[PDB]
């Protein structure tokens, strides 16, 4: 039981941002990350992933992302930037540490690791991202589908789907991007709930910040190859594929689920903080939990801050959260 | 679809060992392993772990463990041995791969990975170990225990336990060794289903191969500090500890469950192969499945060969299982 003013749970860009401001405050604190290496959920994105904005529009507080040389920074660059960032600021990051549980300890909070290490914190900033909680919807007959199934979370490479009939389900950025790539080797069907919405060709992801899906080069190359049409969801799944309410069938060898994530919040279960919808109720700042005021949330998505779940978006909230925690411990 | 005669699932000692024999046979095969590195489950063991036998009693088929300089090999040396081993025999090991499921595909076996990679196999050898299914029993009152719990699986170091009252539950080698070490910083209580059985001070784990707990140096030291005394199981747990049958109460800050493991066979689900006891129905060999004669099982433990879940004792079964698969493919 090291006592610290603030425990930051998660050491991705979100935790790193919190850590940038906690440095500039009086407070003692620690960043606890489960990964083997720095870079957060980026270590788990497919090989070809680039960001949808230039380096300069993908920097977190203070030291900006080094200059990269394409239009858009490669996966490896985010990784490197995140790791250099930790050093530059000598951020107190402990990794690998899986936090099992945050629980009550009087006015403070006890943070417990899978291996028995413990902190006692006046405040906790939960910054554990969404990747660990990949969401797959529930469709009739799905368990009797005989082909291949993976989430976008585990998508890596197009080679495995070569020569197949593949269904890509979900119309976010992941769908459009995975569809783009996989379709260069497989017959592809894009299955989306709503007609997929595209930003203009002459604009990138920065537009989301200044405020649906970005025309990055592979996606542009896909529109040209005539592959970006969607179909609405089937009524159910058969062993060999899907069926629509109008009777229509399609066989598929594989299905790639691009149907989103939820907050990785299993470490706050039993604090009664997690809503049914996989969130937590927050005050008007969007950052401090209603039910337990010692607990802050950072980076999760719009429900937690408009555009908080992006590299450029996170900064605002990081500063805001840390100013509220700074006041709180004085 | 990559076709091979044999897919070996799992790349610890057990999978390396089958690898050795499959190399000497003429079959085409591959070894799929989930970890980030070679070394199987040794990677995930506490810092102080040493083997309970000398290098030469901890060698797998063919190339013996390099000579270690203390009485027993350090964890590091096991990792280095298994790593050097794969190199020396150029074994076809792919890592990380997580095999999600095995399925009937016509004559043969489809092996599917979390990212959609797919082998096609006439024969499968499941060598996935036990570490991934840590076992913790159910105990009345437990869900209210308000202190730290963790399994021997995630035990790292003693510092987390200094000053605590700790229960160590399980009378294997894990209980004895975790107990030895933790009681140098904590007021300890060892809780065991049966009188624990010790081998003679003047002998080591080779005696389990020649057919219970080994007097390894830390354990010897523990017996002398007068801490190797078991107590029987409690009747219930409360929020602060445990209660025994005769009403006695003992408070605890932490419990370390060293209550054993089960086979890691979630990849064999939906093949009617995994028993309610978590095992597989084997033939008189102990190796070949009844329900699917094209699945062999290797390394898991007594039910799967006598001293099969040890370094020295897997070799025999390894050779045996490859013999049966060579023949099966003819
Ligand atoms: C496919 C994909 C493409 C994207 N494209 C872009 C883009 O172009 N530009 C952009 O700005 N954003 C993009 N995003 C959104 C992006 O901002 C990421 O989601 C980013 O990873 C979120 O930052 P984070 O630090 O909150 O997430 P993470 O990187 O998930 O956060 C860090 C995580 O905390 C650790 N953790 C979780 N639980 C625990 C626990 N219980 N105990 C200890 N540690 C724990 C995780 O291991 C650690 O890595 C993309 C996201 C995805 C998924
Ligand atoms: C604390 C402890 C001390 C021990 N002491 C000794 C000792 O002193 N001497 C001795 O001889 N033995 C000892 N043992 C037994 C020992 O042999 C280990 O159990 C050893 O790890 C077993 O080797 P294995 O290759 O069968 O299992 P592992 O080493 O666990 O097996 C390898 C595993 O297969 C992979 N795998 C599992 N599922 C999948 C999947 N779906 N897809 C891909 N890969 C998968 C795992 O990631 C990979 O590492 C000890 C065990 C423990 C737990």
């Amino acid at each position: 039981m090291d006592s610290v003013d603030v425990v930051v749970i998660g050491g991705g860009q979100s935790g790193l941002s919190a850590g940038y401001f906690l440095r500039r405050s009086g407070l003692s604190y620690v960043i606890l990350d489960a990964e083997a290496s720095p870079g957060g959920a980026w270590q788990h994105a497919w090989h070809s992933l680039h960001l949808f904005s230039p380096a300069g529009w993908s920097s977190i507080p203070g030291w900006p992302m080094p200059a990269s040389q394409g239009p858009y920074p490669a996966r490896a660059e985010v990784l490197a930037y995140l790791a250099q960032y930790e050093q530059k600021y000598a951020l107190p990051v402990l990794r690998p540490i899986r936090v099992q549980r945050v629980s009550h300890f009087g006015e403070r909070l006890r943070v417990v690791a899978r291996d028995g290490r413990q902190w006692l914190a006046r405040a906790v900033i939960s910054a554990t991202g969404t990747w660990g909680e990949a969401y797959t919807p529930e469709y009739q007959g799905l368990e009797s589908f005989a082909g291949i199934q993976l989430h976008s979370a585990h998508y890596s490479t197009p080679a495995p789907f070569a020569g197949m009939r593949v269904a890509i389900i979900g119309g976010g950025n992941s769908g459009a991007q995975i569809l783009a790539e996989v379709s260069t080797v497989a017959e592809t069907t894009w299955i989306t709930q709503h007609e997929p919405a595209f930003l203009a060709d002459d604009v990138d992801g920065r537009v989301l910040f200044e405020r649906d899906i970005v025309m990055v080069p592979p996606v542009l190359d896909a529109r040209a190859r005539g592959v970006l049409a969607a179909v609405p969801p089937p009524a159910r799944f058969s062993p060999t594929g899907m069926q629509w309410a109008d009777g229509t069938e399609r066989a598929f060898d594989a299905v790639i689920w691009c149907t989103g994530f939820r907050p990785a919040l299993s470490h706050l279960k039993g604090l009664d903080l997690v809503t049914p919808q996989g969130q937590v109720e927050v005050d008007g700042s969007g950052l401090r939990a209603l039910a337990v005021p010692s607990v802050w949330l950072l980076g999760y998505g719009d429900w937690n801050g408009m555009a908080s779940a992006t590299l450029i978006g996170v900064t605002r909230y990081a500063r805001e959260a840390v100013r509220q925690v700074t006041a709180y411990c004085a």
Side-chain angles (χ1 to χ4, degrees), chain A residues 9-16 32-35 37 39-46 49-53 57-58 82 95 97-101 127-132 152 173-174 177 261 264-267 298-300 308-314:
Chain A
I9 309 170
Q13 68 217 35
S14 298
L16 291 201
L32 300 185
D33 180 58
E35 309 297 338
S37 305
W42 298 106
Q43 286 163 291
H44 301 303
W46 57 87
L49 182 104
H50 290 50
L51 262 32
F52 54 32
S53 288
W57 288 87
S58 305
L82 292 167
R95 151 195 293 122
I97 297 208
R98 179 124 264 150
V99 166
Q100 284 295 275
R101 194 183 33 151
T128 47
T130 51
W131 175 95
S152 64
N173 280 292
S174 288
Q177 271 176 54
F261 307 80
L265 294 175
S266 79
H267 56 297
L298 178 58
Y300 292 104
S308 62
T310 67
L311 272 156
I312 183 143
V314 87

Side-chain angles (χ1 to χ4, degrees), chain A residues 198-215:
Chain A
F198 304 97
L199 307 170
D201 314 343
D202 72 324
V203 129
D204 62 29
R206 79 185 61 207
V207 155
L208 298 170
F209 172 65
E210 300 164 340
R211 269 222 289 289
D212 195 92
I213 109 204
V214 198
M215 310 300 277

Side-chain angles (χ1 to χ4, degrees), chain A residues 174-205:
Chain A
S174 288
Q177 271 176 54
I178 298 188
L179 175 74
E181 191 159 276
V182 170
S183 66
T184 64
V185 310
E187 260 309 314
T188 214
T189 303
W190 198 17
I191 295 160
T192 223
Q193 318 205 28
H194 304 303
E195 211 228 323
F198 304 97
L199 307 170
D201 314 343
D202 72 324
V203 129
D204 62 29

Side-chain angles (χ1 to χ4, degrees), chain A residues 15-25 29 61-63 85 89 91:
Chain A
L16 291 201
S17 308
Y20 175 86
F21 296 97
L22 296 164
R23 177 162 180 288
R24 289 172 116 181
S25 73
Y29 70 111
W63 179 64
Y85 196 95
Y89 290 121
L91 288 188

Side-chain angles (χ1 to χ4, degrees), chain A residues 312-327:
Chain A
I312 183 143
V314 87
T315 288
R316 226 124 64 177
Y317 301 119
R319 176 172 24 239
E320 177 48 7
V322 178
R323 83 149 269 281
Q324 311 184 9
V325 337
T326 307

